[PDB]
Amino acid sequence: PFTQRERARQIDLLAFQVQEISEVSPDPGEEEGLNTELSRLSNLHTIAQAAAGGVELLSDGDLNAAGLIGEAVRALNAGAKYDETVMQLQNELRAALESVQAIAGELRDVAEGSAADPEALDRVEARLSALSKLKNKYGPTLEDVVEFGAQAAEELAGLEEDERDA
Amino acid sequence: FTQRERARQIDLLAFQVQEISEVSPDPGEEEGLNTELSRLSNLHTIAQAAAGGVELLSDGDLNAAGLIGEAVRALNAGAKYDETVMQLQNELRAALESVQAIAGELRDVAEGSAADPEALDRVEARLSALSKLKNKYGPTLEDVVEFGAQAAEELAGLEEDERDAGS
């Protein structure tokens, strides 16, 4: 801000930066809660996709575990008529089948009852993104960003006063 | 004329007598055969049942244990963060173990089978030979044996007539 034109240009620069920061309004310490919420929502999605993946392999897919176990049970039927061991094993296989079906059903409940919220997740990511952008210019911490803005505002007022006198 | 007819009748009867005698049907033998057929066929069914189960649960390119295993792995990422998913995954491991254990016992059934494909085929072959005879000379093996006795007697009378015919 040495020459008159330089000062004019400096005034614009400072005003821009103070404006950019004030608009986002970073509050130091806010990222703690954002990060916690980010991981919570991200994990919720992961949990829901896992449960659904298990349901497909166990029950719903064209090829599935319950389906093969059921075929096995049926293949044992004629044998079970003549041999007590096969009869016993067929019966234990039916119980295994019921367990697999019960598990698939409870996994289905997990996926269906999920509190995953993709819009919420996007909002959390958006705020972290706004703060990151400030930190990449005025950082490295939010404390640093806030002080940058405060020093810019003080410098700006000094230059406006200089212009006021000239 | 009637002479040509007699010659042909001699060949007919001789052939029928030979056919029956070569098989040597013993009326009553079918009871034991049928009992043994069921015994062996049933052993075959048991062994085939255990083999099929092993294939579908474990050994087939596509098998139950393999799919359960994939499902267990699919749950990994969810189990990291959710107690309920983690629990279901553990219950699923238990189900997998049960399925593998069952496939193991089935393999033992097949491996220890007293099935005898050799004996079974031989029992069927005898029953088939007896059935073929009953279809021509039956209905029962008793009838078949009687048919052969009468045929042999008739044959002897014709052969004698021929010898008498030529001095």
Q: Does domain B3-44+132-167 have CATH number 6.10.140.1080?
A: yes
For testing the chain A interface, which of B59, B67, B91, B113 should be mutated: the one with the most A CBs within 10 Å? B67
CA A2 to mean position of chain CA atoms:
49
Contact indicator for B6, B141 with CB cutoff of 8 Å: no
**What is the least distance, in Å, from the CA of A37 to any CA of chain B?**
14
CA–CA distance, A127 with A135 (Å, rounded to integer): 12
Closest CA to A43 of B87, B92, B83: B83
Domain A46-132, architecture per CATH? Helix non-globular (6.10)
Whether the CB of A107 is below 8 Å from some CB of chain B: the reply is yes
Method: X-ray
Q: Does domain A4-45+133-166 have CATH number 6.10.140.1080?
A: yes
Q: In B, which residues are within 8 Å of A65 by CB distance?
A: 64, 67-68, 71
CA–CA distance, B56 with B99 (Å, rounded to integer): 11
Which residues touch A101 (CB under 8 Å, ≥6 apart)?
A: A58, A59, A66
Closest CA to B45 of B129, B102, B109, B97: B109
Residue type at position A160 = E
Here the tokens at position B4 are: 């040509």
**What is the least distance, in Å, from the CA of A30 to any CA of chain B?**
24
Whether the CB of B105 is below 8 Å from some CB of chain A: the reply is yes
CA–CA distance, B71 with A68 (Å, rounded to integer): 14
Closest CA to B77 of A138, A45, A165: A45
State the sign of the Cα–Cα–Cα–Cα dihedral B54, B56, B60, B65.
negative
User: Counting beta carbons within 10 angstroms of the beta carbon of residue B89, is it exposed (0 to 12), middle (13 to 18) or buried (19 or more)?
Assistant: buried
What distances in angstroms separate CA B20 from CA A130, B26, B99, B113, B140, one per listed residue?
Answer: 103, 11, 55, 37, 13
Contact B62 A47 (CB under 8 A): no
Contact indicator for B96, B79 with CB cutoff of 8 Å: no
Contact indicator for A83, B46 with CB cutoff of 8 Å: yes
Q: In B, which residues are within 8 Å of A93 by CB distance?
A: 53, 57, 99, 102
- How far the first Cα of chain B sits from its last, in Å, is 19
User: Counting beta carbons within 10 angstroms of the beta carbon of residue A20, is it exposed (0 to 12), middle (13 to 18) or buried (19 or more)?
Assistant: middle
Closest CA to B62 of A98, A68, A101, A76: A68
Domain B45-131, architecture per CATH? Helix non-globular (6.10)
CA–CA distance, A67 with B64 (Å, rounded to integer): 8
What distances in angstroms separate CA B131 from CA A58, A164, B122, B147, one per listed residue?
Answer: 51, 127, 14, 15
The answer, yes or no, to whether the previous bond of B117 is cis (omega within 30 of 0) is no
Residue type at position A138 = Y
What distances in angstroms separate CA A68 from CA A58, A61, B52, B53, B61, one per listed residue?
Answer: 10, 12, 11, 10, 12
Angle at B111 between CA B109 and CA B114, to 5 degrees: 80
Contact indicator for A21, B30 with CB cutoff of 8 Å: no
In this chain, the answer to whether the domains covering B3-44+132-167 and B45-131 adopt an identical fold is yes
Contact B81 A51 (CB under 8 A): no
Longest CA–CA span in chain B (Å) reads 113
Contact indicator for B98, B92 with CB cutoff of 8 Å: no
What residue spans define the domains of chain A? 4-45+133-166, 46-132
CA–CA distance, A64 with A60 (Å, rounded to integer): 7
Residue type at position A147 = E
Which residues touch B139 (CB under 8 Å, ≥6 apart)?
A: none
Phi and psi at residue A141, to the nearest 5°: -105, 165
Using CB atoms, pick whichever of B46, B56, B74 lies closest to residue A50: B74
CA–CA distance, B10 with B118 (Å, rounded to integer): 40
- Token pair 């212009």 in the structure block, residue: A163
Contact A68 B64 (CB under 8 A): yes
**Resolution stated for this PDB structure, in Å:** 2.0
CA–CA distance, A11 with B124 (Å, rounded to integer): 109
- How far the first Cα of chain A sits from its last, in Å, is 14
